[PDB]
Structure 1
Amino acid sequence: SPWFGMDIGGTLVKLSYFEPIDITAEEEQEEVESLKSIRKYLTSNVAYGSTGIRDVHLELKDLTLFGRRGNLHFIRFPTQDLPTFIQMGRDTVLCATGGGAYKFEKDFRTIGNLHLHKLDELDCLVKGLLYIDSVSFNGQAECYYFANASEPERCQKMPFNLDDPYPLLVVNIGSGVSILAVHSKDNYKRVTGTSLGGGTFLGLCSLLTGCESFEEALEMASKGDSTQADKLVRDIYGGDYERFGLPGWAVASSFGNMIYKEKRESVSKEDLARATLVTITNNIGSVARMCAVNEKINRVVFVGNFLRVNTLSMKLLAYALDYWSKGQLKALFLEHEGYFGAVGALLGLPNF
């Protein structure tokens, strides 16, 4: 049967699909038409229906997996459209993770003889992240950081080696945020989480601006000035708060200048989108910083789809984590964004 792993999150479904490329002459004969149809559909289209997308740039080419060679594909669609997916499937051993592996278990079982194996969303995240870094991104580093993140004229993406990845703090920014302390391949802990995550960005942005997609919210934020909404240290002190080393540009109160009616009447949607992005991103960085200090871990890797096509938040995390930790913590990022749980689920197939 086809080799899939699926991570059904609170907002997005992520699917990893292994396309064999070593199909012999006899194997092609023995391939049933429904299976050939699935493989050709997945590999000849980059858009599936109105809301599924194959992230072609992430494809791992000529990967050896379970003793076969193939291409590993990365596909996403909204969890809201899982009914379309399941209806397509009804018209296979599925390793599935995320909350939706449990929430929609009975729905997957409407597919006759389908064998669903539910796997833990954070176990799959850790296994998938370690796996992808181990095999490399087609010979390039999977992990990167922003060098000189405090100096815009210098700041640039650069590769980072994770060959000995432990210990590692993993900050998974999805709908909500989970924070993991990883001590070895089989020893990690969920330190805590925060509810101020990607769904808070998208939900608050939607309420405040009328945006109707994540991409629109980011486009608005790129044009906005968060300081039109936020109350800064310099708005309270007139300058720095010197005694505790707080710069005047630091945010004292997110959205705190919106207590003034005349400021609410002048602020733009773009300013509000950027203030929402800045508020959520700084809170994630600060929680990660406190967790790293307590866990005695100095490498913090941020993953999850809050950061897909979101260089603004990545650079803010890189700058803020470095600044507020006095250079003791380093922000790291991974090219495969939000797909690690789906890969980790796929990697569970040999156990069944």
Structure 2
Amino acid sequence: VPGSPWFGMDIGGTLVKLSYFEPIDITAEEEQEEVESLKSIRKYLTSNVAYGSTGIRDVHLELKDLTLFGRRGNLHFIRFPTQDLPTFIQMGRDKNFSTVLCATGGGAYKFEKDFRTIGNLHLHKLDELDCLVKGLLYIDSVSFNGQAECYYFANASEPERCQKMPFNLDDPYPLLVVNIGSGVSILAVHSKDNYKRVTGTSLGGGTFLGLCSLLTGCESFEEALEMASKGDSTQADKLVRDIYGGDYERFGLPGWAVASSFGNMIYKEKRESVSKEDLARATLVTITNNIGSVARMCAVNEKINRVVFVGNFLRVNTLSMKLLAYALDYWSKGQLKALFLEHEGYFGAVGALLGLPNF
């Protein structure tokens, strides 16, 4: 492995994710041979938790004293909007920084020519879903600083008992991976080298954020979630009891289940009384439950009972995680389990970093 900072980057449709390995076993002689630009990069990344106006280091996710490529170091996790990649690349071309970059996600292709404006930088494009699988399996194998990387919600159908609990993935196959980013990819993983994309859905995190922005005027993902936490989705949705006056008993649909998402918004007087918060929550519930349903159908067809949900639609989004856990547990009568991972949307970036020794 190369004199070069060790990065892996996943350039998605909405967010760039960057994994950075900071060596902590640097010898006295190594510090001598280190050029100023390399020292400047290391100090900038490790002494700041906000980069410019939109970059964020997720300090709580840092893996400390990881051994990687024969060196000990800390693995850092950084995100910024893809819209701001021109600023990243303009920073990279700065004279104070004159690298082998393993990059994945669609932007590895879309912005290939832009990365090559950085003199002599060597860009290696790696497949988006292969990096996801490799990074997910790697992070679970090294643990989250000794704690479990994977968790589930115990007793997900009872709120008085529902609680996050660690889950052991030491024999993780087979596994359904549901990656909720701008859109959704669903993978059936049979071994480390044997997986297929079962299907996907374009109703993903970008549908939640785009519809929420149109309907409520929210200006950020976090604001959308804050609104949804205060709302009542039943003010927008038409429920089974709104159609039947009760349960649809013959087919086991309870009266409180949604029959038609946003279905009460066909009435003008209801549109005039619904709140922005109600609409935010209805958008979240609609998108989340649709993903849960698709995930359930894929698990049944693939004969897989463990479904891991990743991607940044679920970052700081406990409501959606609990909705997913409840829906899988309820519809399957306990035979399917929703699983979640602490490192959220960073697995592609880690998987890309792991491709470095091949170059």
Give the TM-score range, shorter chain.
Answer: over 0.9
Aligned to 1:3: 6
Deviation at 1:102, TM superposition (A): 0.1
* Cα offsets for 1:126-150 (capped at 9, x unmatched): 0000000000000000000000111
Deviation at 1:25, TM superposition (A): 0.2
* Cα offsets for 1:165-196 (capped at 9, x unmatched): 00000000000000000000000000000000
Distance in 2 (alpha carbons) for counterparts of 1:314 and 1:98: 24
Distance in 1 (alpha carbons) for counterparts of 2:158 and 2:249: 22
Residues 226-245 of structure 1 correspond to what in structure 2 (within 5 A)?
A: 226-245=233-252
Deviation at 1:246, TM superposition (A): 0.4
Aligned to 1:77: 80
Unaligned runs of 5+ in 2: none
Deviation at 1:69, TM superposition (A): 0.2
User: What percent identity do the matched residue pairs reach?
Assistant: 100
Q: What SS does the aligned partner of 2:84 have?
A: helix
In the alignment, structure 1 residue 267 sits paired with structure 2 residue 274: yes
Deviation at 1:203, TM superposition (A): 0.1
Q: What SS does the aligned partner of 2:148 have?
A: coil
Distance in 2 (alpha carbons) for counterparts of 1:297 and 1:150: 21
Deviation at 1:329, TM superposition (A): 0.4
Deviation at 1:325, TM superposition (A): 1.5
Q: What SS does the aligned partner of 1:154 have?
A: coil
Moved more, 147-156 or 182-191: 147-156
* Cα offsets for 1:109-168 (capped at 9, x unmatched): 000000000000000000000000000000000000000111111110000000000000
Distance in 1 (alpha carbons) for counterparts of 2:274 and 2:105: 38
Distance in 1 (alpha carbons) for counterparts of 2:66 and 2:175: 26
Deviation at 1:8, TM superposition (A): 0.1
Distance in 2 (alpha carbons) for counterparts of 1:32 and 1:321: 53
Deviation at 1:207, TM superposition (A): 0.1
Deviation at 1:297, TM superposition (A): 0.2
Distance in 2 (alpha carbons) for counterparts of 1:343 and 1:44: 21
* Cα offsets for 1:50-75 (capped at 9, x unmatched): 00000000000000000000000000
Deviation at 1:232, TM superposition (A): 0.5
Q: What SS does the aligned partner of 2:152 have?
A: strand
Deviation at 1:326, TM superposition (A): 1.6
In the alignment, structure 1 residue 28 sits paired with structure 2 residue 35: no
* Cα offsets for 1:312-338 (capped at 9, x unmatched): 000010011111122110000000000
Distance in 2 (alpha carbons) for counterparts of 1:119 and 1:156: 37
Q: TM-score, normalised by structure 1?
A: 1.00
Deviation at 1:252, TM superposition (A): 0.6
Q: What SS does the aligned partner of 1:243 have?
A: coil
Distance in 1 (alpha carbons) for counterparts of 2:91 and 2:132: 27
Aligned to 1:341: 348
Deviation at 1:229, TM superposition (A): 0.1
Distance in 1 (alpha carbons) for counterparts of 2:155 and 2:47: 41
Q: TM-score, normalised by structure 2?
A: 0.98
* Cα offsets for 1:277-317 (capped at 9, x unmatched): 00000000000000000000000000000000000000010
Aligned to 2:304: 297
Distance in 2 (alpha carbons) for counterparts of 1:297 and 1:249: 29
* Cα offsets for 1:76-112 (capped at 9, x unmatched): 0000000000000001000000000000000000000
Unaligned runs of 5+ in 1: none
* Cα offsets for 1:233-279 (capped at 9, x unmatched): 00000000000000111111000000000000000000000000000
Deviation at 1:226, TM superposition (A): 0.2
Distance in 1 (alpha carbons) for counterparts of 2:17 and 2:27: 29
Distance in 2 (alpha carbons) for counterparts of 1:210 and 1:134: 42
Distance in 2 (alpha carbons) for counterparts of 1:160 and 1:310: 19
Aligned to 1:258: 265
Residues 32-181 of structure 1 correspond to what in structure 2 (within 5 A)?
A: 32-91=35-94, 92-181=99-188
Distance in 1 (alpha carbons) for counterparts of 2:193 and 2:141: 15
Distance in 1 (alpha carbons) for counterparts of 2:261 and 2:180: 20
Q: What SS does the aligned partner of 2:250 have?
A: helix
Aligned to 1:198: 205
Distance in 2 (alpha carbons) for counterparts of 1:2 and 1:9: 21
Moved more, 45-54 or 323-332: 323-332
Distance in 2 (alpha carbons) for counterparts of 1:197 and 1:326: 26
Q: What SS does the aligned partner of 1:244 have?
A: coil
Q: CA RMSD in A?
A: 0.3
* Cα offsets for 1:12-64 (capped at 9, x unmatched): 00000000000000000110001000000000000000000000000000000
Q: What SS does the aligned partner of 2:264 have?
A: helix
